[PDB]
Amino acid sequence: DPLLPGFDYLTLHTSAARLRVAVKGSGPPLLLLHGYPQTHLAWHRIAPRLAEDYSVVLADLRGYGESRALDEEGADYSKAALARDQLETMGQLGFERFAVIGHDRGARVGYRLALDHPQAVAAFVSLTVVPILDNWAAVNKVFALNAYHWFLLAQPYDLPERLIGADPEHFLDYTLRRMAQGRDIYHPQALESYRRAFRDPAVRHAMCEDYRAAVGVDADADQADRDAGRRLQCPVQVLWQERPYAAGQHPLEIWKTWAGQVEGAAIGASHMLPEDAPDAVLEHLLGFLASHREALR
Amino acid sequence: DPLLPGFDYLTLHTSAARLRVAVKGSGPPLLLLHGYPQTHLAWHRIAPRLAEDYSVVLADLRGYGESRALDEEGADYSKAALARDQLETMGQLGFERFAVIGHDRGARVGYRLALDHPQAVAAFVSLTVVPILDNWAAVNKVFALNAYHWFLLAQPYDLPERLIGADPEHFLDYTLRRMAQGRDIYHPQALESYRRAFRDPAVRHAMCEDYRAAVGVDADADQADRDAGRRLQCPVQVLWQERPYAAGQHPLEIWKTWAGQVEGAAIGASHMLPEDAPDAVLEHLLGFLASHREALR
Known part of the structure; x- marks a missing residue:
């Protein structure tokens, strides 16, 4: 079966970035963020099915994959900046309001987009993510042992860049295997794309910048919204990894403090x-989007 | 002024290690652990003065500097194992009971030695350290941002070895500058010794093993002593960096739960x-050792 x-x-050429986008379909718009x-x-196992019923937009986050900041020196990699990229992306393609489905860092861009630009986000799906403020x-x-990289990659420039850049393919491969719990889930051709991006020093730097923003400005933004009592205004679905959650840490409970x-549902993977x-x-996405079909109007 | x-x-050839030791002086014995x-x-700025009045023994910890485990494959780098090295070292030199002065990892070896072998430790001085159980x-x-390396170096073999081994001198130099807060404190010749050791892959591995032990067996040992109500039996001095300490984290308060x-005293450095x-x-060491001169008998 082919990819996408x-x-x-x-x-797409936006005010602050050159963004790689892939699109298919017709109907209400969905933006999927890796x-x-x-x-x-x-998204190669998900997006084709969605494009049977929806307008599907896939984007590389600023600095990841083939997407790049135009400021090659001091670019902003905060989630707020990447949220603005999404507004501009969807706007250029013809959409002022759309659903957002994010995984991992992409879900962090997504919830920030929803908080900052509620008029633009019809519905929001988070895979594996709660707000950074809750994580911290x-x-x-x-936590620090399991997610050691959250602390390594947030060290000041250029410490982590020097470490992860020594043997990029070793570090990428190690990281993907660890995140997959050793399971054989990576399509060999998707893997070559991830590897090529990680071999680019600019991509590795942008990843470190993401992690630095997580510690700093992203957390400050979440705290400001908590202080203001600002919540997501749209329907939210959270799909989480089936594992134990400590009191106060269950993803459904956390999201209910934000929206x-x-x-949501647990998935055994x-x-x-x-x-x-x-x-x-x-199955979960399709059901959610169908249940909130009127919201997508 | 010359070094040492x-x-x-x-x-010294002990049951499980080949240990580099440097000795001077006469009188009651002191073991100093870097x-x-x-x-x-x-210890080059401290040991000469002490050797005017005491028998001074300086050792490289197992795996650090020029000290090596005899088991080059699966050696034990727990603090308990390194504590036994110290017993054997001092015993070979003629001492069954002695004072221990440790800095950083050396203080961790020292308190473990005091807990496990109270008959051997006349007095104990910790520079900058409280027990690992309290740290965790x-x-x-x-904490995790400031001490990111505690989490990186504890990752399973051979992740951190691959990262820190790519450009050993970069990582060593970065780390020493960071620990010194940029202050010009390293004698250029002492520095070459630290650099040579860090260029040895076996040393870097032993350092990772130390950090892994800290997470695991060392913490378990501390917990067992806490459970048993086992405390250090000798006089203790703690010298700590002048900085704010959160409630329950002040080093004097913590040590009073263990002894x-x-x-102790704060030092502005x-x-x-x-x-x-x-x-x-x-000034602090000399006063402590003089105040407990009878204990050293």
Whole structure:
């Protein structure tokens, strides 16, 4: 089976970025946002089915894959900046309001987009993510060991770049295997795309910048919204990895503190839900989007 | 001024290790144990003064500097194992009971030695260290960012070895500058010794093993002592970096939960107390050892 049959590959020129986008379909618009250390190809098992019924837009996040900031020196990689990229992307393609489905870092861009630009986001789906403010409050010994890279990649420039850049393919391959819990989920051709991106020093730097923003400005933005009592205004679905959650850390419970309309489900797979559990993900997504069909109008 | 004038350099062959030791002086015995990422030379500003009045023994920790495990494949780098090295070292030199002064990882070896072998430790001085069990309980976002390496170096073999081994001198130099807060405290010749050790892949591996033990067996050992109500039996001095401490985290308060006889002082310097603040350290050490002169008998 081919990868992304019938998708049209575009390069969009926005005010601050050159963005790689792939589009297919007709009907209400959906924007799908991948995570780390991946590209838009992570959606290859999901996006074709969605494009049977929806206008589907896949994008590489700024700095990841083939997307680049125009400021090659001091670009902004905050989630707020990447949220503006999404507004501009969808606007250029003809959409002022759209649903957003994110995995991992892409879900962080997505919820920030929903908070900052509620008029633009019809519905929001998070795969594996709760807001960074909640993640930081949960840090303990085991968290820091399991997610050691959240702390490494956030060290000041150019410490992590020097470390992860020594043998990029080793670090990429190690990381993908770890995130997949050793499961054979990566299409060999999608993998070559992830590898090529990670071999680019600019991509690795942009990834570090994402992690630095997570510690800093992204967390400050979440705190400001918490202080203001600002919530997501659209229906939210959260799909999470089946595992134990400590008190106060269950993803459905956390999302209900950020949004008045929340639903979700556990999926028995690795963290890499798009690639590991596409049929389960699709069943949930399709049902959610159908249930809120009027919201998508 | 020369480095370690009149010190006699020895290589001791113990049951599980080949240990680099340097000795000088006469009188009651003191064992000085350096930390990470250093060697026994870190004591060069302190040990000569002490050797005017005491029998001074400086050792490279197992795997650090010029000290090596005999098992080149699966050696034990727990603090308990390194504590046994110290018993054997001092015993070979003629001492069944002695004072221990440790900095950083060396203080971790030292307190473990005191807990496991109370008959051997006359007095204990910790520079910058509280027990690992207390450190782990304190982990939060800021801790994990500041001490990111505690989490990186504890990742399973051979992840951190691959990262820190790519450009060893870059990582060593970065780390020493960071620990010194940019202060010009490293004697250029001591620095070459630290650099040579870090260029050895076996040393870097042993350092990772230390950090892995900290997460695992070392913490389990501390918990067992806490469960048993086992405390250090000797007088303890703690010298700590002048900085704010959260409630429950002040080093004097923590040590008083581990020992009945505790004193200490803040020193206004970087973490690298032996090299940054030797005169302050010496004033405190000399006074402590003189106050407990009868205990050293």
